[PDB]
Structures are given as structure tokens and as C-alpha cells.
């Protein structure tokens, strides 16, 4: 397991975020003030469209950011 802490990875058109333990984060995350949802299987950010999460529809920008909240 490679050290890779408290940062994003942009890989093959997908977006991942790594916590302090060098693992890809899943589910809802606030990163630098912005909201993201990382899919529980792939760890990829919900991005570039509308997604239903727990019965609520949200929009995520291409950068993965949830439109307001």
C-alpha cells in the first residue's frame, strides 16, 4: 500500500480522494469546504450529472462537487 495522504487523484477520467491513512474515501465527504459523494464499490466521485443517493436526486459538477446543498 503506497503512501498518498489527504489528496485527490485524477485517474482515467475519474476522481478519487485519499484520507490520512492513504485509502480512497467512500460515501459523503466534505473536502476543502465542498461536498462530494464517492461510490461505495469503485470509490469514484459522482460527477457530471444527476444521481439518486438514498432517495434524493442531486447534481454533481464535472469536478465532482455537489451543487450547493
Amino acid at each position: 500500500a503506497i503512501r498518498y495522504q489527504n489528496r485527490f487523484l485524477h485517474l482515467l477520467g475519474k476522481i478519487y480522494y485519499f484520507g490520512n491513512n492513504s485509502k480512497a474515501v467512500t460515501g459523503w465527504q466534505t473536502i476543502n469546504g465542498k461536498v462530494y459523494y464517492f461510490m461505495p464499490d469503485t470509490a469514484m466521485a459522482a460527477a457530471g450529472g444527476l444521481f439518486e443517493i438514498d432517495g434524493v436526486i442531486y447534481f454533481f459538477g464535472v469536478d465532482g462537487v455537489k451543487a450547493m446543498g
Epitope: 489527504n6 484520507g19 490520512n20 474515501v25 460515501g27 466534505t30 476543502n32 469546504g33
Partner: nanobody, 126 residues
């Protein structure tokens, strides 16, 4: 909603020192010290990541201020040496919940913090 309480503020002469304490009901991923002078915005001063203890500082306090944690006592500390008039401010500590993260370049920006304490006053006289 994490509770934070600061202490150790005071009046001191320029060149002197203070040590602030921040008691927290829990630590997030990071603990920060901010300060706010009259009429200015809050500015982040120092931050520590609670896993491993990496420390970050704003350029104006490097070599003067030191941030540290005691996880046993759920307390974070700011040792403030070689104080100057421009260090006068209300000092407040902050943290965030479990799914809150900051990258190195943002760990001293106020918008990566969710929970704030009350403030302890620091006044540096000439």
C-alpha cells in the same frame, strides 16, 4: 456538534509569550487556531493533523508560534513566542466532523472547519 473551549489568553508586552489551550469534546481529522482582529476577517494561524501530528503555519508566525496536541487530555495548544502588536486578536480554535477533510493548501482556511470555540483574548502592548 463538537464543543471547544479556549483559555490562556492575556495581556503581555511585545517580545513576551503566551500559551493558549483548546479543550475539545472530540478531535476531528485536524485542529486549527484562528484569530480575528477588530474590523479584519478571521485568519488561520496554525493547524495540526490529529493522526500523526503534522503541523502547518501561516508565514507571519513561523518560528514564533508552535501548535501541539495532547490526545489524552483532548487539548490542543498554541505556544506563542516573540509576540508583536500585530498578534493582538481574539484567538479561537476549530475542528470538523468525521467526513470533513482538508488538503495541505487549505488546512488554514476557515471554510474547511465546522466547529468553533468561543475565543480567548490576546493583547500585545508595546
Amino acid at each position: 456538534e463538537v464543543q471547544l473551549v479556549e483559555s490562556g489568553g492575556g495581556s503581555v508586552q511585545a517580545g513576551g509569550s503566551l500559551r493558549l489551550s483548546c479543550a475539545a469534546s472530540a478531535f476531528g481529522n485536524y485542529m486549527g487556531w484562528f484569530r480575528q482582529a477588530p474590523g479584519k476577517e478571521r485568519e488561520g494561524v496554525a493547524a495540526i493533523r490529529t493522526g500523526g501530528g503534522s503541523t502547518y503555519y501561516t508565514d507571519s508566525v513561523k518560528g514564533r508560534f508552535t501548535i501541539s496536541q495532547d490526545k489524552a487530555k483532548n487539548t490542543v495548544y498554541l505556544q506563542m513566542n516573540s509576540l508583536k502588536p500585530e498578534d493582538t486578536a481574539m484567538y479561537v480554535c476549530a475542528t470538523a466532523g468525521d467526513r470533513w477533510h482538508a488538503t495541505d493548501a487549505f488546512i488554514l482556511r476557515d471554510f474547511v472547519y465546522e466547529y468553533w470555540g468561543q475565543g480567548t483574548q490576546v493583547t500585545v502592548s508595546s
